Design an enzyme around this catalytic site. Structure first.
Site, mmCIF file in Angstrom:
data_model
loop_
_atom_site.group_PDB
_atom_site.id
_atom_site.type_symbol
_atom_site.label_atom_id
_atom_site.label_comp_id
_atom_site.label_asym_id
_atom_site.label_seq_id
_atom_site.Cartn_x
_atom_site.Cartn_y
_atom_site.Cartn_z
ATOM 1 N N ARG A 165 14.001 19.438 -69.543
ATOM 2 C CA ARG A 165 12.718 18.767 -69.738
ATOM 3 C C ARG A 165 12.487 17.758 -68.617
ATOM 4 O O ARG A 165 13.384 16.977 -68.297
ATOM 5 C CB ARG A 165 12.652 18.065 -71.105
ATOM 6 C CG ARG A 165 11.253 17.493 -71.366
ATOM 7 C CD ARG A 165 11.028 16.809 -72.714
ATOM 8 N NE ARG A 165 9.589 16.581 -72.854
ATOM 9 C CZ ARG A 165 8.951 16.267 -73.975
ATOM 10 N NH1 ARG A 165 9.614 16.102 -75.124
ATOM 11 N NH2 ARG A 165 7.630 16.116 -73.936
ATOM 12 N N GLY A 225 16.425 13.441 -79.388
ATOM 13 C CA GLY A 225 17.390 13.145 -78.339
ATOM 14 C C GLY A 225 18.696 12.648 -78.932
ATOM 15 O O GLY A 225 18.706 11.861 -79.879
ATOM 16 N N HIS A 232 17.397 16.161 -71.364
ATOM 17 C CA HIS A 232 16.253 15.251 -71.343
ATOM 18 C C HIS A 232 16.207 14.619 -69.958
ATOM 19 O O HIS A 232 16.922 13.665 -69.654
ATOM 20 C CB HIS A 232 16.354 14.200 -72.447
ATOM 21 C CG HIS A 232 15.097 13.403 -72.634
ATOM 22 N ND1 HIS A 232 14.109 13.321 -71.669
ATOM 23 C CD2 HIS A 232 14.666 12.656 -73.676
ATOM 24 C CE1 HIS A 232 13.130 12.550 -72.109
ATOM 25 N NE2 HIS A 232 13.442 12.137 -73.328
ATOM 26 N N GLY A 233 15.388 15.188 -69.087
ATOM 27 C CA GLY A 233 15.273 14.618 -67.760
ATOM 28 C C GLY A 233 13.915 13.992 -67.539
ATOM 29 O O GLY A 233 13.383 14.022 -66.419
ATOM 30 N N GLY A 258 0.116 16.183 -76.703
ATOM 31 C CA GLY A 258 -1.273 16.173 -77.123
ATOM 32 C C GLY A 258 -1.853 17.516 -77.508
ATOM 33 O O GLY A 258 -3.076 17.635 -77.651
ATOM 34 N N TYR A 266 13.788 7.936 -68.475
ATOM 35 C CA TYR A 266 15.151 7.695 -68.932
ATOM 36 C C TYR A 266 16.099 7.965 -67.759
ATOM 37 O O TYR A 266 15.658 7.992 -66.610
ATOM 38 C CB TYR A 266 15.409 8.489 -70.219
ATOM 39 C CG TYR A 266 14.539 7.972 -71.343
ATOM 40 C CD1 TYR A 266 14.699 6.676 -71.808
ATOM 41 C CD2 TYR A 266 13.536 8.757 -71.911
ATOM 42 C CE1 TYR A 266 13.905 6.164 -72.823
ATOM 43 C CE2 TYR A 266 12.719 8.247 -72.926
ATOM 44 C CZ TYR A 266 12.919 6.946 -73.379
ATOM 45 O OH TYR A 266 12.146 6.404 -74.391
ATOM 46 N N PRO A 277 11.259 17.807 -79.385
ATOM 47 C CA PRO A 277 12.311 16.818 -79.671
ATOM 48 C C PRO A 277 11.708 15.467 -80.032
ATOM 49 O O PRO A 277 10.873 14.934 -79.299
ATOM 50 C CB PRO A 277 13.087 16.745 -78.348
ATOM 51 C CG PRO A 277 12.103 17.244 -77.281
ATOM 52 C CD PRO A 277 11.305 18.299 -77.993
ATOM 53 N N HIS A 297 10.515 11.115 -68.865
ATOM 54 C CA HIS A 297 10.004 9.923 -69.556
ATOM 55 C C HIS A 297 10.672 8.624 -69.120
ATOM 56 O O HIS A 297 10.761 7.669 -69.905
ATOM 57 C CB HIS A 297 10.116 10.089 -71.072
ATOM 58 C CG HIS A 297 9.415 11.309 -71.582
ATOM 59 N ND1 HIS A 297 9.705 11.873 -72.802
ATOM 60 C CD2 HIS A 297 8.433 12.070 -71.035
ATOM 61 C CE1 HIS A 297 8.938 12.935 -72.985
ATOM 62 N NE2 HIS A 297 8.153 13.073 -71.931
#
Ligand SMILES: Cc1cc2nc3c(=O)[nH]c(=O)nc-3n(C[C@H](O)[C@H](O)[C@H](O)COP(=O)(O)O)c2cc1C
Ligand SMILES: COCCOC(=O)/C(=N\O)C(C)=O
Length: 367
Positions: A228, A55, A176-177, A303, A181, A22, A179
């Site tokens: 995630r 996202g 999206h769980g 990466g 946020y 994503p 980074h």
């Protein structure tokens, strides 16, 4: 090449294990998916390949980037449908990542210039700056810490957005769980300073993600839901005192949701701690510990190269490998990895610009 051994992601039969990660690209002008998005995902779609979208906003308060898509209006659903159709015509599977930035936002991104919402009143520190619509960098403001009623409403935003994604034809969604946020603002004890039932203990800090996952599982079925997380990440002041324990606590709750629902989630998606914008061995060990603990499909991200991806799958470290930056600059990244063809460099300067073509769809295919 183990990246091209087929893999059954529950109800989806994949022909290879190269996943489009994503990636926010900011071409969805005024939060409406644009035709440019259709060309971009079409270029990257392959037969039996798995794509995850940028996202996507679940509500008017979810955004902290300019011109990111939403899926909370019928207009947005209508435009997403055209994009999903052309991806499916290529035989790919595509999931919509549902994204709320929480406190990683700005007055300019919020209705009526209101304060962003979060688990906490603490702002992201001045070490981080937010990208503004005019290309400058602004200051993260002080967020508003929401109550449990408002928490339950954000969960409902996730549930409605998951249903809209199915209405647009998506094969499923990804929570999206990660980074730093909104969900990670509840998970991380560096951020969550709440004194109610949503903070103060590891179990309480996992409540929000558990209730989000439960709501979307109930709405569209576990096998259409990916999750995630990034328990060890250096992003937006999202630290935890015990990243492995936080990760294993999340995994246990995902396992329990699966047992209670009688079906496995689509996957768990974890960001490698080496991904940036402490030991190398301890970071690979944290990833494998989480993988071994989770009853289902594991997607690793952050990466990866061609060689690192082959090795992750050959060694059983992951079932699928998602690529971000290399997929920006190589529309046919899958074919290039198959042939071991040289990969083309990416230009970070056009990662988040608005041009429908430049740095977006004008990276060429193999000649
Ligand atoms: C420009 C850009 C935008 C990204 N947007 C998102 C996003 O919206 N949601 C998300 O979960 N990860 C996002 N990521 C992280 C990627 O999903 C992926 O994990 C990361 O790029 C993998 O590292 P790699 O670029 O070396 O392949 C983004 C990464 C980049 C470079
Ligand atoms: C160093 O980790 C960075 C993780 O943050 C992201 O990758 C991201 N979204 O999740 C965007 C919008 O770039």
């Amino acid at each position: 090449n183990p990246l091209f051994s087929p893999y059954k992601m529950g109800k989806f039969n994949l022909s290879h294990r190269v996943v489009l990660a994503p990636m926010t690209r900011c071409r969805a002008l005024n939060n409406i998916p644009q035709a440019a998005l259709g060309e971009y995902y079409e270029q990257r779609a392959t037969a039996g390949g798995f794509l995850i979208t940028e996202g996507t906003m679940i509500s008017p308060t979810s955004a902290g980037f300019p011109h990111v898509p939403g899926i909370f209006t019928k207009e947005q659903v209508r435009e997403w449908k055209k994009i999903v159709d052309v991806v499916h015509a290529k035989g790919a599977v595509i999931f919509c990542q549902l994204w709320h930035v929480g406190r990683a936002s700005h007055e300019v991104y919020q209705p009526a210039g209101a304060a962003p919402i979060s688990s906490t009143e603490k702002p992201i520190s001045n070490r981080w700056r937010i990208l503004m619509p005019d290309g400058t960098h602004g200051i993260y403001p002080k967020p508003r810490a929401i109550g449990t009623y408002e928490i339950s409403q954000v969960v409902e935003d996730y549930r409605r957005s998951a249903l809209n994604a199915i209405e647009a034809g998506f094969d499923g969604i990804e929570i999206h769980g990660a980074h730093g946020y909104l969900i990670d603002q509840f998970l991380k004890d560096g951020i969550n300073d709440r004194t109610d039932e949503y903070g103060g203990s590891l179990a309480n800090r996992c409540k929000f993600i558990t209730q989000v996952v439960q709501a979307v599982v109930s709405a569209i079925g576990a096998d259409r839901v990916g999750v995630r997380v990034s328990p060890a990440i250096d992003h937006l002041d999202a630290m935890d005192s015990n990243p492995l324990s936080l990760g294993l606590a999340v995994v246990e709750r995902l396992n329990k949701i699966q047992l209670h629902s009688g079906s496995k989630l689509a996957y768990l998606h974890v960001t490698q701690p080496r991904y940036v914008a402490g030991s190398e061995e301890e970071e690979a060990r944290l990833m494998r510990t989480l993988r071994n603990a989770y009853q289902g499909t594991f997607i690793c991200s952050g990466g990866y190269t061609r060689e690192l991806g082959i090795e992750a799958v050959a060694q059983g470290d992951a079932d699928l490998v998602s690529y971000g930056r290399l997929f920006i600059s190589n529309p046919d990244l899958v074919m290039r990895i198959k042939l071991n063809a040289p990969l083309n460099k990416y230009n970070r300067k056009t990662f988040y610009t608005q041009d429908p073509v430049v740095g977006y769809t004008d990276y060429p295919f193999l000649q």
